[PDB]
Amino acid sequence: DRVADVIESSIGDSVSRALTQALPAPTGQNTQVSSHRLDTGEVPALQAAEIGASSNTSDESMIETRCVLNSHSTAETTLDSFFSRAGLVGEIDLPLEGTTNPNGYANWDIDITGYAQMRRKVELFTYMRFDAEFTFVACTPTGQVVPQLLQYMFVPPGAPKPESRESLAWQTATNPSVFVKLTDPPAQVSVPFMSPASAYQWFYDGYPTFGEHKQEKDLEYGACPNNMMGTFSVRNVGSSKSKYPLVVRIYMRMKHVRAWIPRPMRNQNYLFKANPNYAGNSIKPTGTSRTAITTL
Amino acid sequence: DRVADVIESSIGDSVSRALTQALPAPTGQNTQVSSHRLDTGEVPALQAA
Amino acid sequence: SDRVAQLTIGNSTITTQEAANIIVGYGEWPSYCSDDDATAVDKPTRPDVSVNRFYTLDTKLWEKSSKGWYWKFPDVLTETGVFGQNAQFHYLYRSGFCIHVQCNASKFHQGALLVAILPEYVIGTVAGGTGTEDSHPPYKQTQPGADGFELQHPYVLDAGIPISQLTVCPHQWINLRTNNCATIIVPYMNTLPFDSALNHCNFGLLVVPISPLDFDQGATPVIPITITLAPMCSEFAGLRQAVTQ
Amino acid sequence: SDRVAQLTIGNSTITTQEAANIIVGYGEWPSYCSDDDATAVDKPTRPDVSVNRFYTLDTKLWEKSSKGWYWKFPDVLTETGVFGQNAQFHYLYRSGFCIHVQCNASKFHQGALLVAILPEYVIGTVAGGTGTEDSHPPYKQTQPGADGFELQHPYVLDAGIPISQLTVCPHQWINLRTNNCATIIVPYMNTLPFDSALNHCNFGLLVVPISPLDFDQGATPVIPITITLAPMCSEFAGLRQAVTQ
Amino acid sequence: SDRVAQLTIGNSTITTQEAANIIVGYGEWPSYCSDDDATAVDKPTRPDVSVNRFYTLDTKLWEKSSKGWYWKFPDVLTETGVFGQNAQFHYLYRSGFCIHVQCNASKFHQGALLVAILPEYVIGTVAGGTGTEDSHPPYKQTQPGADGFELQHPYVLDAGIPISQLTVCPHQWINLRTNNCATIIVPYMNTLPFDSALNHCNFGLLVVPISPLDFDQGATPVIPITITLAPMCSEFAGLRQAVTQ
Numbered sequence A: 001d002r003v004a005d006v007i008e009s010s011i012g013d014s015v016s017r018a019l020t021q022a023l024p025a026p027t028g029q030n031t032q033v034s035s036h037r038l039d040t041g042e043v044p045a046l047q048a049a050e051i052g053a054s055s056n057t058s059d060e061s062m063i064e065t066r067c068v069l070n071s072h073s074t075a076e077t078t079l080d081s082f083f084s085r086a087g088l089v090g091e092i093d094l095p096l097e098g099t100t101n102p103n104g105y106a107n108w109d110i111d112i113t114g115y116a117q118m119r120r121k122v123e124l125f126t127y128m129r130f131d132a133e134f135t136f137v138a139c140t141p142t143g144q145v146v147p148q149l150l151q152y153m154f155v156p157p158g159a160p161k162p163e164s165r166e167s168l169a170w171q172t173a174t175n176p177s178v179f180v181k182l183t184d185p186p187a188q189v190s191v192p193f194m195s196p197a198s199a200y201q202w203f204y205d206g207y208p209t210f211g212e213h214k215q216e217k218d219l220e221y222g223a224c225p226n227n228m229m230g231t232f233s234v235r236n237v238g239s240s241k242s243k244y245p246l247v248v249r250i251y252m253r254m255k256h257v258r259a260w261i262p263r264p265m266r267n268q269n270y271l272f273k274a275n276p277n278y279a280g281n282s283i284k285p286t287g288t289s290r291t292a293i294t295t296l
Numbered sequence B: 001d002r003v004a005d006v007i008e009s010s011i012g013d014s015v016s017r018a019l020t021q022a023l024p025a026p027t028g029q030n031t032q033v034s035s036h037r038l039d040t041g042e043v044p045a046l047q048a049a
Numbered sequence C, D, E: 001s002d003r004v005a006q007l008t009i010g011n012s013t014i015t016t017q018e019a020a021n022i023i024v025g026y027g028e029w030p031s032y033c034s035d036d037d038a039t040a041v042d043k044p045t046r047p048d049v050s051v052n053r054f055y056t057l058d059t060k061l062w063e064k065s066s067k068g069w070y071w072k073f074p075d076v077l078t079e080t081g082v083f084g085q086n087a088q089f090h091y092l093y094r095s096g097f098c099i100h101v102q103c104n105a106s107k108f109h110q111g112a113l114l115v116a117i118l119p120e121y122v123i124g125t126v127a128g129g130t131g132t133e134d135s136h137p138p139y140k141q142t143q144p145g146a147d148g149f150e151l152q153h154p155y156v157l158d159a160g161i162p163i164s165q166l167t168v169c170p171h172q173w174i175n176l177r178t179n180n181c182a183t184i185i186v187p188y189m190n191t192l193p194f195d196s197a198l199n200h201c202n203f204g205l206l207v208v209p210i211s212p213l214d215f216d217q218g219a220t221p222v223i224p225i226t227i228t229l230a231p232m233c234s235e236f237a238g239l240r241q242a243v244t245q
């Protein structure tokens, strides 16, 4: 009735093999007593890096050890623990005189790869899923607090991006806006994991267009639309000149984090957003350098 | 109450390990019958000084 | 019973007598897409044996001065074989891989290659040297297919990241005094159940000489390195006409 | 599971991948002194890990003409390490040893060293050649400490006894085509429970090339031999000030 | 536990550390003659240990151009040893054999000998070249005893049959990169329970280089091949005076 190779055909197994399990690691591993071992056949110290596995040699088999009850915690090295710390990710200028952002409004493309500290941290992993708490610290360039009313509006990709301080999009009938005086404590808001993918992707090795991929378009290599969350717009709430030069610092703090596929830490300086370019001529070593391997 | 490495610490074992025992040798060892053995894997004649 | 091994998939069988065990990427065997993980409502194609097999794609020559090479993956196998076809006709693709890099020499030769799997391996430019120019790596560099590409600044994996740390990735070494081949088994890894085999490359295969090849003169100097990969649990959906890119 | 081995004592660990089993002197592991075997009424010190460890004391160069060397033992380890100290401060000393002599070469080299433990190894003089003079071996010869001493008439072990029979003593060979190190484990052996580590040497370590070192020219000619010993079950009693000799 | 082996019969013991298992001709150990298989009514002699042992009869030199050699069997062992005697004094003979051909070289040498047992190995002449002359191989060629004989046209085993097929016979190869000796154990094979060891040769031992010996100059060029055979379950009947042929 069947053909056997069809009854066996393990094609369609949705479950992943595994091989490894997750164990409780509340504290560091304890050290149990060790004694001299003079025997042939058992060689812990001998390993083979070629295999591709880290040496599994225990302190106990390398020296006579005492007993130590390690109660040191590992809580501070969790992801939420490590990543859930507010950091600067965006900065916006609203000067009186200038060419940057006059007219009293600004459209900041929501991209957290513009500030080296925060960027390097996350670029530790390839994928990352999480909610976040955005805080907005506004004031004048002197750090002086001023009685001015702003309006921050999150504009999802597709929504009409404001073209002027008095644009119609500021009616914000469905977009979520926040009205704040620069004298009120920094506005703070909770943001869900909004993406069509299951996790944000710091690195996307490929294109999104699907076309020819000529020279003029290599601009899109590495551009993954599942991270383009839209823009953040801000404007002084009025009809006339703001009267004061403003600056908004955007701080993001992740929470409910899930990270996957750890990769090498950024070695060189950063040059552009969403683009791992590096200075070809100024390729500095990862660390410090000595004069000889035989001296400190 | 103790420190473990002290409870184990085999330091102070007055008895010698040994490994070998003394057996009765009143006469020379006897010779038991032998027959041809043509097999791979067992090599008595091969030693390592 | 650990240095010798045989890998058999489809109608292909690889033999090795000096291998150093098998690495299973992130400790997970390649699986098919779950019913609750998928979204594409059309019933997919699972060619099985016609595409899940060992394609021996390329050979490089290791020289006392080689810098290293890489191959982007989803892609490398396109245009070649029935796999290639299903990857061009279908929009959506999904699959794990069994990568077997081999390279032998004599007991009188010496050297050591690092063989890693770097997921989402985005390439970067030298930025015009000074760093003022916002250049971008060309299609010929980001998606070299077979033949791979040679690294220009291996120390930073042409992407500003230390190769010294590349081992946090499924890797294996080919130390000539120890083995003559590496074997990594990567599962499908992406933030999506399926994606276009064409314009997205799930990971790159790195093969870099960390300890330079060397041998007294007179010993055969042609030391090749051959890549042989095999898709596993290949699934395709979203059938249309055939597409190259 | 017999040619590879690891010895771990104190905070020292020796590795070997070509050893030929371990010899246990007179088939007896080193023990501490029994309550009915001892006489010294004071409670002794058993430093354990601070003195029971692997001291890598010396290196000799094996040459196509080397005669052989010896090291008297209790002594060799004085002045060096915490062991040395306890041996100088205390009158009475007691301890077994784990001696590991190592020497490697290539598969293209050849030779064979005899490594023996001769208890109460009394040295003798050539008696002024003719045999009429009653000369005596000097302190520099009978108690050379580390650095050992070179034999002048190995055939008779500079003591009028055939080396051909030296194997009735805990021994092991270092045949280069077979291994690269010897491992003897001698227990404390004296006619007394304790004795002065200073003026009495329980036994000597002999290392003699019976089958001369040889190799075609062009192969590294510097073939060292290194001695590494480790006290076991060290006990000390009779504490006074520190004494050199 | 498969590459090393020891064969012990009578008062002879062969050792080997690179053998490649043992072949048992036609899967049958040598047996004595059944009571219903025999016809000779006289009670036979079964010398056992005095004749069932390892006779190391000959040595040939393998050269980059050697053609190959053969030894007819029942015969090869006559005149040599107590076996020889019982074979001359008795009319009827019966016995199986343990043939051990050995030949070693270095890991830097290369070559491969085919070692087969061809039952009823009848030799043929070149028929005077043209094929018109009905010549016949001489006693010196059909029954060369020890020393064997060298093949003149190995491709056809000097008997018009392809050597390419000689493997349907109990065989074993001596590939120098793999082993250093062959071991075949042939049972008594004839269409009779006993026959004259003198004028009938149950089978021949073939040793032919299929893959030529070769080595870079400077490596010892004298590569011998030694034959060592041992009768098993030897039985003799029909006693008369001693006969040579």
Ligand SMILES: Cc1cc(CCCCCCCOc2ccc(C3=NCCO3)cc2)on1
Pocket (backbone or CB within 6 Å): A110, A111, A112, A113, A132, A134, A152, A153, A154, A155, A176, A177, A178, A189, A191, A200, A201, A202, A227, A229, A232, A274
């Ligand atoms: C009120 C209110 C709240 C806001 C801002 C909401 C911001 C939500 C941002 C979520 C950002 O997730 C990111 C993931 C990836 C990247 C990225 N940049 C380079 C490629 O990856 C940037 C942001 O505006 N107004």
